[PDB]
Amino acid sequence: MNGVYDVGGTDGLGPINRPADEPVFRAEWEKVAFAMFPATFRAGFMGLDEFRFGIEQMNPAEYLESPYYWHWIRTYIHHGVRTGKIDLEELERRTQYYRENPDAPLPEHEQKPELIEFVNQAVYGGLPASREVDRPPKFKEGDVVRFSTASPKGHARRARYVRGKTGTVVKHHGAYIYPDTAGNGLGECPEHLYTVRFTAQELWGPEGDPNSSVYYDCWEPYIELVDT
Amino acid sequence: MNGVYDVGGTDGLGPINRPADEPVFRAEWEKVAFAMFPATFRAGFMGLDEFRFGIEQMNPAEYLESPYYWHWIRTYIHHGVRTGKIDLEELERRTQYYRENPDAPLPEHEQKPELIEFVNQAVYGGLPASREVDRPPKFKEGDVVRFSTASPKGHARRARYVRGKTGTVVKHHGAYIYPDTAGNGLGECPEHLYTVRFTAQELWGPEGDPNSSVYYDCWEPYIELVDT
Amino acid sequence: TENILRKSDEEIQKEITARVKALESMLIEQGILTTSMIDRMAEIYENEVGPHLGAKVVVKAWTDPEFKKRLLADGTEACKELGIGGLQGEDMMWVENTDEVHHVVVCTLCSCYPWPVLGLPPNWFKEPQYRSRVVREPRQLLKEEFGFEVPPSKEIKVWDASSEMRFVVLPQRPAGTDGWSEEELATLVTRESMIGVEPAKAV
Amino acid sequence: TENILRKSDEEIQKEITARVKALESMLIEQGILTTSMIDRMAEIYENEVGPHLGAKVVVKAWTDPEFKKRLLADGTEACKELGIGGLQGEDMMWVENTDEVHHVVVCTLCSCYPWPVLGLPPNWFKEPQYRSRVVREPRQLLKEEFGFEVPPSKEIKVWDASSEMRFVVLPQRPAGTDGWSEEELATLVTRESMIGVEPAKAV
Numbered sequence: 001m002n003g004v005y006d007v008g009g010t011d012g013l014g015p016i017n018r019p020a021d022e023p024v025f026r027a028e029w030e031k032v033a034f035a036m037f038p039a040t041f042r043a044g045f046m047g048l049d050e051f052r053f054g055i056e057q058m059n060p061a062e063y064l065e066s067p068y069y070w071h072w073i074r075t076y077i078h079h080g081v082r083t084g085k086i087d088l089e090e091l092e093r094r095t096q097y098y099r100e101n102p103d104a105p106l107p108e109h110e111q112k113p114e115l116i117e118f119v120n121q122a123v124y125g126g127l128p129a130s131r132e133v134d135r136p137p138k139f140k141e142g143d144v145v146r147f148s149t150a151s152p153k154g155h156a157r158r159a160r161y162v163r164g165k166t167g168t169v170v171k172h173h174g175a176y177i178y179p180d181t182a183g184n185g186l187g188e189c190p191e192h193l194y195t196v197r198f199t200a201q202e203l204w205g206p207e208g209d210p211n212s213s214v215y216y217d218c219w220e221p222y223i224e225l226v227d228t
Numbered sequence: 229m230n231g232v233y234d235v236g237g238t239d240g241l242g243p244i245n246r247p248a249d250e251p252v253f254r255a256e257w258e259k260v261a262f263a264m265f266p267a268t269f270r271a272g273f274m275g276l277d278e279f280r281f282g283i284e285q286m287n288p289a290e291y292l293e294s295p296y297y298w299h300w301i302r303t304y305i306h307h308g309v310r311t312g313k314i315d316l317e318e319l320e321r322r323t324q325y326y327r328e329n330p331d332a333p334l335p336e337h338e339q340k341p342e343l344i345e346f347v348n349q350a351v352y353g354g355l356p357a358s359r360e361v362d363r364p365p366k367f368k369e370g371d372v373v374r375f376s377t378a379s380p381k382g383h384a385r386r387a388r389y390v391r392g393k394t395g396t397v398v399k400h401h402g403a404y405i406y407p408d409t410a411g412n413g414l415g416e417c418p419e420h421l422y423t424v425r426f427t428a429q430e431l432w433g434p435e436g437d438p439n440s441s442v443y444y445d446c447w448e449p450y451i452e453l454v455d456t
Numbered sequence: 457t458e459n460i461l462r463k464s465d466e467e468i469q470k471e472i473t474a475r476v477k478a479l480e481s482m483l484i485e486q487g488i489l490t491t492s493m494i495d496r497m498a499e500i501y502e503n504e505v506g507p508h509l510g511a512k513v514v515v516k517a518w519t520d521p522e523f524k525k526r527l528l529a530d531g532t533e534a535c536k537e538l539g540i541g542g543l544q545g546e547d548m549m550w551v552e553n554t555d556e557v558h559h560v561v562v563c564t565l566c567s568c569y570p571w572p573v574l575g576l577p578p579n580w581f582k583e584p585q586y587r588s589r590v591v592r593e594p595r596q597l598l599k600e601e602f603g604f605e606v607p608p609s610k611e612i613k614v615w616d617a618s619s620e621m622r623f624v625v626l627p628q629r630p631a632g633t634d635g636w637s638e639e640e641l642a643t644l645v646t647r648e649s650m651i652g653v654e655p656a657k658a659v
Numbered sequence: 660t661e662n663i664l665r666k667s668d669e670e671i672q673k674e675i676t677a678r679v680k681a682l683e684s685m686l687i688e689q690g691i692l693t694t695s696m697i698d699r700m701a702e703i704y705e706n707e708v709g710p711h712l713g714a715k716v717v718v719k720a721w722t723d724p725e726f727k728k729r730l731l732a733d734g735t736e737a738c739k740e741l742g743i744g745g746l747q748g749e750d751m752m753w754v755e756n757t758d759e760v761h762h763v764v765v766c767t768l769c770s771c772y773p774w775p776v777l778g779l780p781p782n783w784f785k786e787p788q789y790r791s792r793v794v795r796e797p798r799q800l801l802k803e804e805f806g807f808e809v810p811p812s813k814e815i816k817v818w819d820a821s822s823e824m825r826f827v828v829l830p831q832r833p834a835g836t837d838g839w840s841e842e843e844l845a846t847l848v849t850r851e852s853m854i855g856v857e858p859a860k861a862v
Contacts, residue, residue: 002237002238002239002240002592003238003239003240004232004238004240004241004288005768005769006767006768007767007790007791008767008768008790008794008795008819009230009379009388009767009791009794009795010230010232010787010791011229011230011231011381011791011795012229012230012231012285012286013288013787013788013791013792014287014660014788015660015788015804016783016786016788016789016792016800017782017783017786017788018781018783018804022781022782024704024778024779025701025705027672027676029672029675029676029679029680031700032679032683032697033679034700034701034704035692035696035697035701036683036686036692038696038700039686039692039696040686040691042691043686052768052769055769057240058240059242059457059458059459060232060240060289061288061289061292061293061459061461061462061664062459062460062461064288064289064787065662065665066460066671067671067675068770068782068785070460070675073675073679076682077682080682086682090685091682091685094680094681094684094685095677096677097681098676098680098681098684099674099677102676102677102680106680106683106684106687106694107684107687107688109687109693109694110690110693111693111694111695112690112695115691115692115695115696116695116696118696119696119699119700119703122745122746123703123708124744124746125746126744126745126746126747126749126775127746127749128749128750129749129750129823130749130750130823148433149430149432149433149434150433150434150435151237151433151435151436152435153239157768157821159767159768159819159821160237160388161767161794161795164392164393171752173750173752173822173824176750176822176823177823193822193824195752195824202377203794203795204379204795205376205377205378206377207378207379207380209796209797209798209811211814211815212797212798212814212816213814213815213817214794214817214818214819215816215818215819215826216819216821217819217820217821217824219822230795233565233566234564235564235584235587235588236562236564236565236587236591236592236616237564237588237591237592238584238588239588239592241584241585241588241589242457242585243457243585243601244580244583244585244586244597244601245579245580245583245585246578246580246601250578250579252501252502252575252576253498253502255469255473257469257472257473257476257477259494259497259498260476260477260480260494261476262497262498262501263489263493263494263496263498264479264480264483264489266493266497267483267488267489268483268488270488271483271486271488280565280566283566287662289461289662289664290661290662290663290664293459293462293664294468294663294664295468295472296567296579296582296583298472301472301475301479304479305479308479308482313486314482318482319478319479319482322477322478322479322481322482323475324474325478326474326478326481327470327471327474330473330474330477334477334480334481334484334491335481335484337484337485337490338487338490339491339492340490340493343488343489343490343492343493344492344493344496346493347493347496347500351542351543352541352542352543353542353543354541354542354544354545354572355543355546356547357546357547357620358546358620379795385565385618385619387564387565387616387618389564389591389592401547401549401619401621404547404619404620423549423621431591431592432592437593437594437595437608437612439608439609439610439611440594440595440612440614441611441612441613441614442613442614442615442616443613443614443615443616443623444616444618445616445617445618445619445621446618447619459664460671460675460678461662461665461666461671462664462665462666463664463665463666471663472663475663
């Protein structure tokens with residue numbers, strides 16, 4: 001979708017806030033928000049592409065100024081409601097309870113070794129998105145291609161700044177989970193993936209840096225040939 | 229500039245808020261904010277194009293959710309500071325005073341008949357931006373033109389959704405104040421003005437409404453010929 | 457809607473009120489703003505200038521084919537025949553709804569709107585929700601927000617007022633109004649009908 | 660910075676804390692989240708996985724031309740030689756700074772970053788200010804924000820991680836380090852140097 005999260009090329013967002021140091025987690029709630037990702041992923045709330053599409057649907061003013069891990073909480077609730085695994089009315093009641101009683105205990109629960117094994121296997125093994133497909137790649141290194149002007153309402157990786165722009169294929173990486181299906185609940189439907197080079201003058205117009213380029217990753221359906 | 233105010237084509241901003249009725253002014257402060265425009269315009273804080281460029285420089289989250297006439301207050305202060313007509317430290321002190329003493333009087337002042345005449349003349353006479361220039365128009369009705377991919381940091385009327393798009397000239401209106409100079413304090417430098425028709429498929433891609441078009445006003449430097 | 461970062465409406469109004477009163481106090485001391493100047497601007501746009509003026513223009517076009525030709529040819533000059541014009545309508549272009557075309561007007565980049573015929577815009581017109589969506593999905597927006605179904609075979613033309621040119625829709629004259637007076641016809645003409653988000657009122 | 664609509668940091672933290680504790684309580688009752696699972700994830704990214712791992716890879720490339728060739732050929736396979744890889748670095752592509760080219764990495768659409776070599780990103784990387792500007796004015800951003808002047812004749816290549824491919828910069832080996840140990844060279848390699856917003860530390 002054409003949401004405010006698609007910030008590449010946006011002006012006026014202000015100076016970078018970069019403290020001279022910072023902890024990994026600023027508060028206990030951030031650690032919880034972070035660990036909730038493997039938990040909700042294992043429980044089938046969402047895959048990675050769907051996870052991103054939840055954050056893309058936030059209130060844009062909230063998105064621009066809220067703590068990063070708050071975006072994660074919003075996407076958990078989004079997918080909890082979408083799958084019927086979270087009852088909003090119960091969540092609202094519990095929120096008020098912990099507002100009023102912040103030191104009240106969490107529910108009694110058993111520890112589960114299988115959740116630790118899940119964490120260790122994901123962290124050290126990874127969740128590779130590379131897939132084999134039957135079709136060979138359409139494009140190759142040095143092909144001049146144009147990026148789609150399509151503007152899907154659903155999840156995609158189509159930054160407004162690259163739409164309809166011409167570039168050169170730099171690398172074919174093989175096929176990967178396709179966000180335009182996976183992020184909308186339509187499955188992996190993997191597509192060949194390319195890095196494409198766009199000049200700064202192509203992106204930003206005749207006044208752009210003549211000695212800069214942007215490298216952007218394009219799934220096969222995003223690009224069509226100008227010159228082989 | 230490429231600010232968040234340039235919302236045409238943005239997704240995810242939410243449902244339209246349209247109460248079944250509403251007053252012209254929701255509060256006394258709105259009337260003040262509104263009348264401050266002729267006052268600061270007559271006093272040389274800003275012209276209309278500069279006025280818009282002040283609002284474009286707001287904090288984008290503030291812009292998206294603040295009451296409309298608050299955008300007007302921000303641009304007055306912006307141009308007050310820019311011209312040295314407003315001292316920020318005095319404004320901050322007075323703000324705290326009226327926070328603490330909201331019913332404290334405004335300063336004693338004389339009424340000025342010339343300000344009423346100014347208001348009546350602006351409202352009924354207007355502030356026409358049409359100008360005569362020495363050059364004839366470059367383009368005419370039916371010319372196929374491409375909109376610039378330039379991305380100036382300063383004021384312009386270059387909506388991201390029309391940049392690099394192809395359309396047809398519909399009407400030549402004559403020459404007008406040019407925002408790219410006027411809004412950046414560089415004078416009227418008037419340019420011929422055209423309405424250009426863009427198809428919804430040109431703007432939004434192959435899935436766009438086949439029976440919709442957008443009409444957008446283009447100053448001459450914004451467009452170059454494809455087909456006469 | 458929900459932003460967990462946002463203050464209450466009451467706290468926002470309290471802060472804005474103090475900030476505006478402070479700025480007002482400084483412009484008063486500079487001699488450039490007065491209580492009479494504030495009251496005059498408010499009175500004009502509360503009581504004098506409003507969509508009743510646009511309605512007079514529409515009904516004259518509906519009942520006078522020669523005036524309608526002059527209105528579509530040069531909207532500013534035509535409205536001046538009725539003593540209608542001025543601030544933020546120096547340059548008006550009127551566009552005619554037909555059985556083949558529907559017109560809707562927006563200002564994607566800000567809040568531009570033809571004050572002399574419509575008065576000040578309603579808040580929804582100035583807000584990002586309408587502005588963002590009407591250039592991209594006008595057919596769906598008209599149906600979903602305004603209950604106005606434009607059949608897919610009919611062209612929708614969206615006019616984005618990026619300049620000082622002001623676009624105003626001349627809505628189609630509703631059926632069942634043959635021989636009506638200009639006063640009776642004016643009851644069918646709404647601000648919404650001259651923006652293009654609704655047709656003129658059915659009888 | 661200033662948004663008149665925004666609550667205090669304290670009020671925002673209070674609200675988020677209650678909302679997260681509520682959601683945590685529900686996921687615990689579902690049997691899908693536990694206190695031990697939370698602690699394990701935190702410990703890994705606080706103490707185990709961080710930019711010291713990326714520094715081992717850089718210093719091996721700086722001292723071993725054959726390893727540097729394998730690293731530039733297939734970053735995932737090369738890092739696995741050092742037991743380095745996993746979550747959010749399944750697919751790594753390393754790019755070599757030279758006297759002719761400077762590389763800088765961003766994720767304009769979100770916060771994508773190579774966890775196995777850098778750990779979790781710093782907040783500035785994930786925030787809209789860096790993301791918006793680095794694809795548009797990288798030369799000015801490096802100078803103004805990081806005090807890093809890239810002469811205009813030198814190409815800047817900005818890598819926008821729109822996919823699961825993760826880009827990591829191999830910074831140039833600073834002058835004055837001939838014959839240094841891998842341990843001594845690692846003191847010059849920073850997270851910033853592998854993002855491309857700074858060179859490796861000068862001696």
